[PDB]
Amino acid sequence: IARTFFDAPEKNYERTMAILQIESEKAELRLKELEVRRLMRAKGDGPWFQYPTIDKALIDHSPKATPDN
């Protein structure tokens, strides 16, 4: 029965170790994602939460009719 149907204890042991490593890395990544999202919401210096402003390519720099502008 052990030779035909059952997995070895060593195989299960190392499979469990691999599973634990993968989910531990995923959990640390999730916590870092939450911290990064909170920081970029708070400060707004990063690539996320960049709400649009007015583009400066629409300004006319030619001389106008009145010098005071």
Binding site: Y13, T16, M17, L20, Q21, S24
Partner: protein, 171 residues
């Protein structure tokens, strides 16, 4: 067979039968009939089975586990080392349960063997039983159904803190 050092037994002392009457006891006749009609065919069948087993021989081994570092040298929230430490702790826990079982079996065997003088002739077995029960209770009790190595470490740390504080009161 089993090992006699783990399971101790005193050498037996059987008195000789010295009858005082002339009536033959039926026990001897029934015993002779028992090795005649029962023991001989049973032993012959066992000899045949043993010959068939000696025709085809193979072995099996007792699994050995090396020592992995325990939970006291494991970084917290580092599952890779804590998993091995917890597996080692659970294996040790099962081994200690069977050790206490062996000592209980020793105590019951001593009581049954001694019979009517059990409360004098089994002092050593009772002392060994008390020692192993005290150590098991100080090691593994009051953990709960969700026991782990961390709970055992916390219980041991609390016990050593209490012992050190009680020493400091009486110093």
């Amino acid at each position: 067979s089993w090992d006699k050092d783990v399971y101790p037994e005193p050498p037996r002392r059987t008195p000789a039968p010295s009858p005082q009457t002339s009536l033959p006891n039926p026990i001897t006749y029934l015993t002779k009939a028992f090795d005649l009609l029962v023991d001989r065919p049973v032993t012959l069948v066992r000899e045949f089975i043993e010959r068939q087993h000696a025709k085809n021989k193979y072995y099996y081994y007792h699994r050995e586990f090396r020592r992995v570092p325990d939970i006291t040298e494991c970084h917290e929230k580092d599952v890779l080392c804590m998993f091995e430490a917890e597996m080692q702790w659970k294996r040790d826990y099962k081994v200690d349960q069977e050790i206490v079982n062996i000592i209980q079996e020793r105590l019951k065997a001593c009581q049954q063997r001694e019979g009517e003088s059990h409360r004098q002739n089994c002092a050593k077995e009772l002392q060994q039983f008390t020692q192993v029960v005290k150590a098991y209770q100080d090691r593994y009790h009051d953990l709960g159904a969700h026991y782990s190595a961390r709970k055992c470490l916390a219980k041991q740390k609390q016990r050593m803190l209490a012992e050190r504080k009680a020493t400091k009161e009486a110093a």
